[PDB]
Amino acid sequence: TAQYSIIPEPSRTELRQETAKTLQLLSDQEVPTLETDAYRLTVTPQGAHLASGGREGRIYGLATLRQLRDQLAGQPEGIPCGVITDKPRYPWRGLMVDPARHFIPAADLKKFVDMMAYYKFNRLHLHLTDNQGWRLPVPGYPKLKSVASRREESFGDGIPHEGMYTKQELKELVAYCAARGIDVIPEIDMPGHNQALHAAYPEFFCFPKPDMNVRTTAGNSKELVCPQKPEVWKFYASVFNELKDIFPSGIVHLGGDEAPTELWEKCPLCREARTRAAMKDEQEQMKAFFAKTAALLAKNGQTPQFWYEGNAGIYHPGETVYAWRQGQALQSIEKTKKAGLNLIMASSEYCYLDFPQIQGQRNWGWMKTTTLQKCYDLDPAFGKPEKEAGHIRGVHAPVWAERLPDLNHLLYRAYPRACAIAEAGWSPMGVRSWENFRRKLADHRQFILKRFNYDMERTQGNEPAFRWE
Ligand SMILES: [Zn+2]
Numbered sequence: 112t113a114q115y116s117i118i119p120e121p122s123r124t125e126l127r128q129e130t131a132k133t134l135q136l137l138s139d140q141e142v143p144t145l146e147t148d149a150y151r152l153t154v155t156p157q158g159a160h161l162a163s164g165g166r167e168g169r170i171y172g173l174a175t176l177r178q179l180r181d182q183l184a185g186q187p188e189g190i191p192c193g194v195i196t197d198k199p200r201y202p203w204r205g206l207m208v209d210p211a212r213h214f215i216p217a218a219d220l221k222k223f224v225d226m227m228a229y230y231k232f233n234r235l236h237l238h239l240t241d242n243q244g245w246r247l248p249v250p251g252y253p254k255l256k257s258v259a260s261r262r263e264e265s266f267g268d269g270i271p272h273e274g275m276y277t278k279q280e281l282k283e284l285v286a287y288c289a290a291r292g293i294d295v296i297p298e299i300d301m302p303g304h305n306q307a308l309h310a311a312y313p314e315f316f317c318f319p320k321p322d323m324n325v326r327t328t329a330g331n332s333k334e335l336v337c338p339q340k341p342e343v344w345k346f347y348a349s350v351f352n353e354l355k356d357i358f359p360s361g362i363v364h365l366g367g368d369e370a371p372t373e374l375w376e377k378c379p380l381c382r383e384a385r386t387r388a389a390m391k392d393e394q395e396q397m398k399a400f401f402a403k404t405a406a407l408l409a410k411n412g413q414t415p416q417f418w419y420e421g422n423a424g425i426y427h428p429g430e431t432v433y434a435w436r437q438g439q440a441l442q443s444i445e446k447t448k449k450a451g452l453n454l455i456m457a458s459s460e461y462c463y464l465d466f467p468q469i470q471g472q473r474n475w476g477w478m479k480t481t482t483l484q485k486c487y488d489l490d491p492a493f494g495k496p497e498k499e500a501g502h503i504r505g506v507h508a509p510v511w512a513e514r515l516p517d518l519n520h521l522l523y524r525a526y527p528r529a530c531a532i533a534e535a536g537w538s539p540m541g542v543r544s545w546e547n548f549r550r551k552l553a554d555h556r557q558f559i560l561k562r563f564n565y566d567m568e569r570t571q572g573n574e575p576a577f578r579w580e
Pocket of ligand 1: 316338375
């Protein structure tokens with residue numbers, strides 16, 4: 112029987128036993144009888160009718176109409192008539208890109224955004240800073256451009272890699288995303304992930320090293336900013352003010368994953384600061400660091416987000432954290448509920464799209480394989496009902512880019528698993544099935560070829576070649 116191939120699967124589809132050979136939009140109304148994020152699309156032999164509860168629902172309805180037009184373009188016999196009534200399961204449906212590890216030019220970001228909007232993603236998270244590069248310009252700190260935005264090579268390849276966005280480019284990105292229903296979330300990791308910052312501004316750190324260079328390999332850095340130094344707090348105030356100007360979401364992801372604190376332990380300034388504050392250890396110092404940063408953000412009307420660490424203690428009720436450790440999803444759901452935290456599911460078992468998608472593709476000596484079928488197994492609530500897991504805001508898939516040097520590589524690992532993530536964030540469990548998703552994705556190969564000039568076919572051997580190992 113003839114059906115639609117819309118991804119994500121709509122919450123309700125009622126097909127009729129007639130065929131439509133045109134999708135001309137005959138009516139387009141806003142009505143109070145639909146939620147602001149909801150739409151109803153009626154496909155008739157004469158054309159389509161769209162009703163929506165608000166601008167957001169209208170964006171989604173037009174995205175569904177776009178997919179139906181692609182299907183009809185491939186089906187000259189027509190597509191079924193029917194009524195689609197639709198609204199998302201979760202309000203947060205996100206992808207993260209990592210320009211700190213490999214810079215993503217503006218044009219390439221635009222293509223990435225168009226593709227994620229096709230699948231009704233509504234959050235774009237930018238990992239802007241890390242050991243391997245710093246991509247956010249900050250007035251008054253020119254060495255961020257001249258030093259921190261450049262590295263000499265990647266993994267011994269002898270090829271320099273550099274880049275930094277302009278403020279104007281980032282405001283363009285924000286407007287481009289907004290027009291496509293997407294909010295943009297910056298991430299500035301602190302106090303660690305800061306080898307590039309140290310290369311530019313060694314005076315911000317407990318043990319300044321003028322010979323420090325921007326990192327060209329993966330691994331953990333012990334270089335933490337020294338919370339006793341006034342230049343650090345002036346710098347981060349400047350950072351947060353730039354983010355306030357550029358990013359209207361007002362959300363600032365601070366990282367927050369466990370950092371090595373050996374250098375704080377040894378720092379003569381931090382040692383005496385801990386003694387004055389009767390702090391027992393460097394974890395108490397970390398709690399104080401994040402309380403101070405959260406206060407700076409609050410003075411700005413901004414709110415922090417974190418990669419969840421169950422035993423961190425740096426969170427205040429109402430904040431939002433990301434669940435990411437394998438095997439910890441259900442525990443994190445329970446713990447955040449008890450702690451009054453909101454939770455975004457980014458479990459690396461399902462959502463870390465830097466991992467290879469077919470067994471035998473490059474795993475860089477450590478990555479597990481996450482197939483499309485495994486990815487589609489994701490239920491963000493892990494079996495818990497809406498009344499017990501209402502603090503779960505949605506789903507988020509990071510495409511970490513240590514080993515993804517350009518858009519071609521990035522999209523190879525992001526898609527088609529991002530389509531599965533989109534359906535996990537949008538579609539109620541009652542309309543989800545691997546067999547239906549697999550059928551639709553088969554059709555989407557042609558849809559994406561025609562609309563984006565991009566090939567989503569995946570075989571063990573057709574990943575683009577790498578220069579490393
Ligand atoms: Zn220190």
